[model samples]
Each structure stands twice: as structure tokens, then as C-alpha cells.
Target: GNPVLTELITGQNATSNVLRFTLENGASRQFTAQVRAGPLTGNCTQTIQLESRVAGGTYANLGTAGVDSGTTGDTLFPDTLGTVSNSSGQTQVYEVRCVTSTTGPGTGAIDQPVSYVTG
Candidate 1:
């Protein structure tokens, strides 16, 4: 089932969607995003990134993954799990976006942004 995640920021070019996550002390979490439909026109790159922030600090990029054209059903965010945690009760945020790296403008939808039980 899709996790009840909070949508954070989105990409401007495409109708992108990003979701936020939480990682408790002594815990591990995993997340991933998949392309749903559209943006099949240009050479677009669909990517998902994992970001983190201290309990009350700024956010920073943790890891990222990308899928080029002809990889619609493919998933982003290699490993799926938001690895390399900083013990101290920091919050993890997951974001998904599609960017047309070349050719022309493009758009796509990411469905079923998911998360699993902490490791």
C-alpha cells in the first residue's frame, strides 16, 4: 500500500510531486517512486532524491536516482532505502521529479511513492 506521506516541494517544469519522511532514532527507512504516465515525447529524465534534516535543522540531499526515456515502468532512487543515516532523530524527506534534460519540455507523473518499515 502507498504510505500516507506529506507532499513537500515539486518541480516547476513538470507537474512533479515530492514527499517527506521521518526517521526515528536507531531506525532505518526506505523509499521509492515510479513513473506513472506521459512525458513520452522528449528525452526527459525522471529522478527521485532523498533529503534529510536534523530534528530542527535545514534539509540536505542524501541520494538520488534517474530514469531516461524509454524507462517508464522503471523505478528511481537506487536501493530504495534512504541509507547513511545520522543518528539523532533527524527527519528524512523523499522527493520525486521529472526533468527534460534535452530535446524539449516534457512532463510525467510518479505514482505510488512508498516507504517500508524501518530496518
Candidate 2:
């Protein structure tokens, strides 16, 4: 086994979106192993996952892409609700919401909040 990166995020932000983590060799990757939203919830309807790598690549235990609801009074990376999975068809996508509370969350925010392309 080797350190392989299944995901590579550009920046960190709190918005509604998804991310894909692939490798240059195209032989390894991973996504959200499990997602946890809120203090205690049944997890979000939208979840992602990938395959486990050697855990020794540019992709560390850190995070990758991110998203925000882009609410009126919401901030970027307010509170991490849940995480994506790293499996066959899953990607390291962090579906975030700009506003603390969400009802009509938008898409797109500013400033990267997380990253998975760090060593």
C-alpha cells in the first residue's frame, strides 16, 4: 500500500456543492467514510464516498472541497455538519451552508475552508 490521494480539492468554502478526488495514476482514491450533520442527526440525504488509499499521499486525513448554502447572514465554514465517504462512487465533497440555519440555502460562497491536497 502507498500514500494515494483519491481526492483533490481546490479550496475550502461553505456552499452547496460536490467534489471529486482522483489520482494521476488513476488507481487509488477515497471519499467520505461517514457523514455527520448537526449535533446528532440521521445524516444528510446527499452523501459521498470513495476507496481507502495507503494513507501516505498528498491527500492526508485533512479535508478537500467544500460548499455553502450561501445564506443571507451565513458565514463560510460556519460549522461542519458532516463528511463525505471515500468509496467506489463517492467523493470527498463537503456540502456546507453559509447560514448557521438553513431553509433556502444557496450555492457558492468565498474563501476556501478545507483542503485535501496538502502534504
Candidate 3:
């Protein structure tokens, strides 16, 4: 089951949290994300960032998809990221993170970690 992010965060700086997973070589998967409009003081486009890193390696961006205030219920980005494979000769660690930050009167966007399955 995927976790629904309900924490209300507000700020101009990009604040984020991640959901990490492990994958074998040649493995691929796609995940889902949900977002909602922020409070009256909120106005920013929050993003869901996908990043990956091999064992003991630095993290790198795989892709990013998101929704904003005007977006309706469970705004979905199909195939936000393509297949992910690891050829680093080691297990790879992948992350799905919610990034909150954008220039506006206020910043806010809640995210949910929807289920992910093999791509």
C-alpha cells in the first residue's frame, strides 16, 4: 500500500521527504502521486521528484512530476518516469520524494505516495 502524505507544510524553501525502495538490475516500475490545493495562504507548485543512487553512490535525478493549486483531485501524471535499471554492479536505491517550494504569497502542497508496480 502507498502512504498518503497529509502533513501541511508552508515555506518558500524546497522542503521534501522521500520514500525509498530497492531494485534489482533491469528492474523497472512506475509510481503514482496525488496533490491538493493549499490553504488560503498557499500558492505554489509542489513536485514529486524521482531520484536513484547505487549502493554508496551519490543520488541523481531520474525525473520529476507534480501538481499545483489549480489541480483537481488526485492529479495524476501517467508514466511520470520510465523504466529504471541498475548496471552499477550493485543494488540501486530509488526514491520518490515530495518537494515543497515555489515563489508565491505562500507555499503549500500535500502529496500522497500512491502504489507503484513493475513498469
Candidate 4:
């Protein structure tokens, strides 16, 4: 299904696709994230973003790459999702999202959802 994104509202905000995984002590997680989008009005910006909640609590921005408005089509950012380690042995919940910041009236099409990069 096509993920419909809008400006001001959905844009400049994060999506609610949360990823849950259990991490044993001394376990590390490494992978890539991506999101492709185009603006319905003003040019938009997208990013492969991640927020974490230890035992499902708060949220914060995980290090990720920036994206263009995708002048063409669904542009894929194969950049790494940033390396993170779980030493606390806690079950971490990550919010998988394509953070977009749009201007004016917009209806962006989310071409790609967050997933592990098959390398």
C-alpha cells in the first residue's frame, strides 16, 4: 500500500511504524534504513530516522542520513542505520519512520518503508 504523507501535519513529524526487538547483553544491531518521498506541493525533505525507547518509554533521534525531495521518483538511501549496542540487556523498541519536513500544501508518497538492508 502507498503511504500517504502530507505537509506541516504528517511532515515535520515522525510516522508511527515502531520496530520491537529483544537484545541480549552485549548484543549489537547494525543495518540500513531508507525512505523515498515526493511532495504534493512544496519540495520536501525526508530522512531514514529512528527513535528508541528502552522497554518502550521515550523517543529520540537516532543518527541517520538526510534525503532529497526525490526529483525523479522513489530514491533509496542505502546508508547504514547507525551502529547501536544493547549492554543493558533490555528489550528496545524502535520507531521506524521516514521523517519528512514539507512546506506549503503537500501530499507526499512514501515509496519505501523502514527495513533492514540486504547486503
TM-score of each: 0.46, 0.24, 0.50, 0.55
Question: In terms of lDDT, which candidate is strongest?
Answer: 4
Ranking by TM-score: 4, 3, 1, 2
lDDT of 2 by residue, 52-106 (tens): 2223333322243233333334343332222324454433333222212223323
Give the alpha carbon lDDT tens digit for every residue of 1-119 in model 1: 23555442233133334444455557655543333334354335444444554545655655564334444333322122345443666545433322212223444443334311122
lDDT of each: 0.39, 0.29, 0.44, 0.44
Instruction: For candidate 1, give the lDDT.
Output: 0.39
RMSD of each: 6.9, 12.0, 6.4, 7.6
Residue lDDT tens for model 4, 1-119? 21322222132345544455555568665534554445334444445455455555666666665444433333433233544567775654333333434433434554444432211
Best by TM-score: 4
Task: Please write out the lDDT profile of model 3 over residues 1-119, one tens digit for every residue.
Answer: 43332222223234345556676666665544334434435444444444455545666665565434333232322223433565656666665443433444553333334323222
Q: In lDDT terms, how accurate is model 4?
A: 0.44
Tell me the spans in candidate 3 whose CA falls farther than 4 Å from its real position. 1-17, 67-83, 89-96, 108-119
lDDT of 4 at 49: 56
Candidate 1 ranges beyond 4 A from true positions = 1-24, 70-80, 84-86, 89-104, 109-119
**Angstrom error at residue 119, model 1:** 11
* Candidate 1 residue-wise lDDT at 108: 45
Off by over 4 Å in 4: 1-14, 39-41, 70-80, 89-100, 103-107, 112-119
